[PDB]
T-cell receptor
Framework: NQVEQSPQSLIILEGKNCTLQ??????????LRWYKQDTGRGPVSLTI?????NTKSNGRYTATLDADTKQSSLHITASQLSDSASYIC?????????????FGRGTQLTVWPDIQNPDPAVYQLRDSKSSDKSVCLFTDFDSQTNVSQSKDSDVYITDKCVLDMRSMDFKSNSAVAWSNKSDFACANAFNNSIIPEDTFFP | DIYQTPRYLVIGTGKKITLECSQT?????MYWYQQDPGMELHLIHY???????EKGDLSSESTVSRIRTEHFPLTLESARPSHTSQYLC????????????FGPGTRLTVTEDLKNVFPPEVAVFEPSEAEISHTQKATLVCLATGFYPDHVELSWWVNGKEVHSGVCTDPQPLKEQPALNDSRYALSSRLRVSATFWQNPRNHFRCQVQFYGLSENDEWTQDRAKPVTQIVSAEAWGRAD
C-alpha cells in the first residue's frame, strides 16, 4: 500500500482531543482527503487538501498537510460518541481524468462515555410471555468492564452498548443476555464475564 | 445526487444480479467498491467516463457497463455465496477539490436456497421493577430473532414517532449458529426512559423491525408464509404498577 495510517485503532474518552496520522509514498501528489466511515455506511468526505494548502477545517475536524515529508494529521477537538468511526486517508496523484485514488486501510476510533457514577447491576426483564425467552440486563458499569460470550450455545450474550439519554445528560453501558432453557437465571447469566465486585443482583 | 438500487438483495446461487447506480451531477469518474462488514474498502471497478471500464485492485466475477455518463451498473452473471457483501458506488466531481460522493450502497446476500430466508420474530421485554426502584429509570429490551438474511433495520417508536435518544441497538447481529454459512441471526436493542415516563399508562412503546426479503417476483412453493419484505413489530404500554 502507498498509503499508511496510524494508529491501527485507539480508544479515547469523550471530551478529549485525538490526532490521527497518514503517511504516503504516492508520486506525483495532487490532493489528500480524510473520510469518516460509520458502521454499515459509505465513507463521508471530511477534508480535501491540495499540495497548496497546509490546513483545512471541518467543524471539530482539523486536517494538516506537509507535502514535503508526505504526511497528514487529522485532529479531532473535544471528541464525542458520534466520532466513533473508521477514518480513511485517501490520496490522489492527478487532478486530471487519468488520475487515481489510493485508499489507506483506516483507523478505528472508539470514543467511550465518561461514566462518573457507575451503578453496575444485572436485572431480569419481565417476559412478554408472547415470547419464550428470558432476558437479563447487565447495565450501568463503566467502559473498563469487558462482556464475554457465554459458554453455552443456547445462551446469547450481546456486547456492551452505549445508550445516551440526552435529557438527563446521562449515558450508560449495557449488555443483553437471553436463553430459552429453564436452566437460565440472571444470577449466572454473565458468569463468564469479569464484573465489578459491587454489582447489584436484586 | 448519486443513487443505488436495490438497497438490499437476497438471491439464490446461480442467478443473474444487476445492481443499479446512477447520478445526474454530470460526473465522469465513477467507482464500484466492495466491503464486507468490518473490513476495508476494496475498489473493484472504476471508470474515467462515458465509454471507459477498468478493473479495480481486487478480482471479481462481476462486470460493469458505461454506455452513458449517468449510469454505471454492476452485473453478477451467476451469483455465488462468496459474492455476499456491501457494494458501494461513487463519483467524483470535475470541479474544485474533486470531492467523491458515495451512493447509499447495496447490501447483497447470496444464499444457497431461498428457503433459508426467514423474517424476524420480534419481542419486547418490559422494564425491571428492581431497576425502577434502584435507578428511577426503566429499560425496555427488544429482541429480533431467527432472521435470515441479516437485512434488517430496527427502530423504537414512542407514541407514533421514532425515538433516537436513550436507544442502543447492536452494531452487528449475532449468529444463532456461528458454524453454518446460512445461519439465522439475532439482534438486541435497548430503550431507556425515566421511571415516571414508563409508569404513565398513556405512553405507548413499539419496537419495529424492517426486514428485507423476497419480492412479488420471487417464486414460493413452500407452505410457510413467503418471507417477503415486511415490518415485524412488538409493543408495550406504560405500567401502572
Amino acid at each position: 500500500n502507498q498509503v499508511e495510517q496510524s494508529p491501527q485503532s485507539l480508544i479515547i474518552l469523550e471530551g478529549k482531543n485525538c490526532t490521527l496520522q497518514c503517511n504516503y509514498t504516492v508520486s506525483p501528489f495532487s490532493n489528500l482527503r480524510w473520510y469518516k466511515q460509520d458502521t454499515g455506511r459509505g465513507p463521508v468526505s471530511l477534508t480535501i487538501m491540495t499540495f497548496s494548502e497546509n490546513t483545512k477545517s471541518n467543524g471539530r475536524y482539523t486536517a494538516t498537510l506537509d507535502a514535503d515529508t508526505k504526511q497528514s494529521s487529522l485532529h479531532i477537538t473535544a471528541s464525542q460518541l458520534s466520532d466513533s468511526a473508521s477514518y480513511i486517508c485517501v490520496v490522489s496523484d492527478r487532478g486530471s481524468t487519468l488520475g487515481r485514488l489510493y485508499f489507506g486501510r483506516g483507523t478505528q476510533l472508539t470514543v467511550w462515555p465518561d461514566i462518573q457514577n457507575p451503578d453496575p447491576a444485572v436485572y431480569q426483564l419481565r417476559d412478554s410471555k408472547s415470547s419464550d425467552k428470558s432476558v437479563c440486563l447487565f447495565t450501568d458499569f463503566d467502559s473498563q468492564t469487558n462482556v464475554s460470550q457465554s459458554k453455552d450455545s443456547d445462551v446469547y450474550i450481546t456486547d456492551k452498548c452505549v445508550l445516551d439519554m440526552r435529557s438527563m445528560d446521562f449515558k450508560s453501558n449495557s449488555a443483553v443476555a437471553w436463553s430459552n432453557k429453564s436452566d437460565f437465571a440472571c444470577a449466572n447469566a454473565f458468569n463468564n464475564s469479569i464484573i465489578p465486585e459491587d454489582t447489584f443482583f436484586p | 445526487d448519486i443513487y443505488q438500487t436495490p438497497r438490499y438483495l437476497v438471491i439464490g446461487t446461480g442467478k443473474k444480479i444487476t445492481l443499479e447506480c446512477s447520478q445526474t451531477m454530470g460526473h465522469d469518474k465513477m467507482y464500484w467498491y466492495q466491503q464486507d462488514p468490518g473490513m476495508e474498502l476494496h475498489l473493484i471497478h472504476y471508470s474515467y467516463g462515458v465509454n471507459s471500464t477498468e478493473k479495480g485492485d481486487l478480482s471479481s466475477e462481476s462486470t460493469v457497463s458505461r454506455i452513458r455518463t449517468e449510469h454505471f451498473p454492476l452485473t453478477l452473471e451467476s451469483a455465488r455465496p462468496s459474492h455476499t457483501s456491501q457494494y458501494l458506488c461513487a463519483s467524483t466531481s470535475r470541479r474544485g477539490s474533486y470531492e467523491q460522493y458515495f451512493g447509499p450502497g447495496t447490501r447483497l446476500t447470496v444464499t444457497e436456497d431461498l428457503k433459508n430466508v426467514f423474517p424476524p420474530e420480534v419481542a419486547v421485554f418490559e422494564p425491571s421493577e428492581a431497576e425502577i426502584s434502584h435507578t428511577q429509570k426503566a429499560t425496555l429490551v427488544c429482541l429480533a430473532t431467527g432472521f435470515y438474511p441479516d437485512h434488517v433495520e430496527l427502530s423504537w417508536w414512542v407514541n407514533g414517532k421514532e425515538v433516537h435518544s436513550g436507544v442502543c441497538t447492536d452494531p452487528q447481529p449475532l449468529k444463532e449458529q456461528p458454524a453454518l454459512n446460512d445461519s439465522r441471526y439475532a439482534l438486541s436493542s435497548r430503550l431507556r426512559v425515566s421511571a415516571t415516563f414508563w409508569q404513565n399508562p398513556r405512553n405507548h412503546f413499539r419496537c419495529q423491525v424492517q426486514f428485507y426479503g423476497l419480492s412479488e417476483n420471487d417464486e414460493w412453493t413452500q407452505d410457510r408464509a413467503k418471507p417477503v419484505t415486511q415490518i415485524v413489530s412488538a409493543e408495550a404500554w406504560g405500567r401502572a404498577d
